[PDB]
Amino acid sequence: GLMQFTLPVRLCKEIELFHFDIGPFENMWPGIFVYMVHRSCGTSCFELEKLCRFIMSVKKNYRRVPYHNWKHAVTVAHCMYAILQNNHTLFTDLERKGLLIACLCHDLDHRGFSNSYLQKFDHPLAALYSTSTMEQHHFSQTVSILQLEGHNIFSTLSSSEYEQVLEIIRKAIIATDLALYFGNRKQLEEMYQTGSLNLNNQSHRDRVIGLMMTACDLCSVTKLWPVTKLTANDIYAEFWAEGDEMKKLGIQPIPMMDRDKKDEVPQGQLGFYNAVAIPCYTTLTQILPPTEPLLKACRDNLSQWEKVIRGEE
Ligand SMILES: CC(=O)Nc1nc2cc(NC(=O)c3c(C(=O)N4CCC4)cnn3C)ccc2s1
Numbered sequence: 574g575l576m577q578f579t580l581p582v583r584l585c586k587e588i589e590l591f592h593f594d595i596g597p598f599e600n601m602w603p604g605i606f607v608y609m610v611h612r613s614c615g616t617s618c619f620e621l622e623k624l625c626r627f628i629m630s631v632k633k634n635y636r637r638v639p640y641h642n643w644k645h646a647v648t649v650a651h652c653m654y655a656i657l658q659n660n661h662t663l664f665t666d667l668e669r670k671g672l673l674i675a676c677l678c679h680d681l682d683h684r685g686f687s688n689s690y691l692q693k694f695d696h697p698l699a700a701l702y703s704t705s706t707m708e709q710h711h712f713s714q715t716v717s718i719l720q721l722e723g724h725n726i727f728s729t730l731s732s733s734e735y736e737q738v739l740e741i742i743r744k745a746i747i748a749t750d751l752a753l754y755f756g757n758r759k760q761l762e763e764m765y766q767t768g769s770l771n772l773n774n775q776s777h778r779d780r781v782i783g784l785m786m787t788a789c790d791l792c793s794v795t796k797l798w799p800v801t802k803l804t805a806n807d808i809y810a811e812f813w814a815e816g817d818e819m820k821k822l823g824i825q826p827i828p829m830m831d832r833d834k835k836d837e838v839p840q841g842q843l844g845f846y847n848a849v850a851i852p853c854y855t856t857l858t859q860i861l862p863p864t865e866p867l868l869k870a871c872r873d874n875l876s877q878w879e880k881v882i883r884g885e886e
């Protein structure tokens with residue numbers, strides 16, 4: 574009832590900014606998340622005891638991989654918190670509840686390998702889920718944890734509201750499959766430029782939440798340069814391990830995944846900013862103008878990768 578989470582002053586101010594970094598203190602991350610839920614959603618949204626038990630079971634089901642870990646989950650949830658806080662009136666009660674949970678859960682039980690690697694390995698999950706393999710797995714783990722004893726944070730919702738929130742979470746988690754992003758963003762780009770984008774149209778809201786999910790998921794490219802650059806090392810630590818596992822299956826990995834091609838990382842980042850990141854934050858900014866700081870920070874980081882190529886660092 575009367576129990577608020579409060580943070581130290583620097584975190585209390587910086588957490589509202591898009592480029593906030595959650596810090597190296599793992600034990601403070603549950604508190605930062607509950608803080609965000611309380612301000613994004615209400616202190617009434619969830620029973621504290623149930624939400625705490627849920628967060629700790631979610632944490633326990635993230636693995637100790639270099640990038641797709643608990644720290645990525647909380648980071649992606651913080652970006653969603655900053656989008657929601659800058660767009661107060663655009664989103665429903667169920668959406669505010671569902672989307673922070675979706676973000677915390679979106680990579681549950683990730684092993685550090687792409688959908689492609691599971692399909693080439695012939696992983697059991699690639700028979701159970703023929704597309705968006707890992708994302709259907711993450712949603713499955715989310716429903717699992719929701720059904721543990723004392724972990725139902727949506728218990729106060731009706732049957733039909735519960736079903737709507739699990740459908741928000743399902744679509745939001747599926748949308749983090751970057752293979753689906755290209756087409757989603759093209760459709761949003763055409764819809765916004767013919768002026769047919771309508772936020773009372775459920776299929777349209779769905780697409781706009783999908784693009785938010787991509788934006789939050791990629792938000793390492795919207796941080797201050799030293800955070801962006803050190804995160805990129807964790808991302809490539811995973812990619813290069815996948816490359817090694819590809820070579821164990823007798824397959825030349827794509828260069829993105831080949832550690833022998835470490836030299837090509839700056840040019841690889843240019844391709845990624847130009848083909849994915851910049852277009853993502855561009856279309857997001859057209860639909861939700863107060864998200865422009867993510868586009869600005871992404872452009873600042875592309876310019877830093879351009880300097881790495883020109884040997885100015
Ligand atoms: C020599 C050469 O081609 N290097 C290349 N590097 C890349 C890097 C990316 N992608 C990324 O760098 C990335 C992702 C990303 O794709 N994710 C999938 C799971 C997180 C999320 N954030 N960031 C920065 C894509 C294509 C290429 S080709």
Ligand SMILES: [Mg+2]
Nearest residue numbers: 679680707749
């Ligand atoms: Mg993922």
Ligand SMILES: [Zn+2]
Nearest residue numbers: 679680749790
């Ligand atoms: Zn992710």
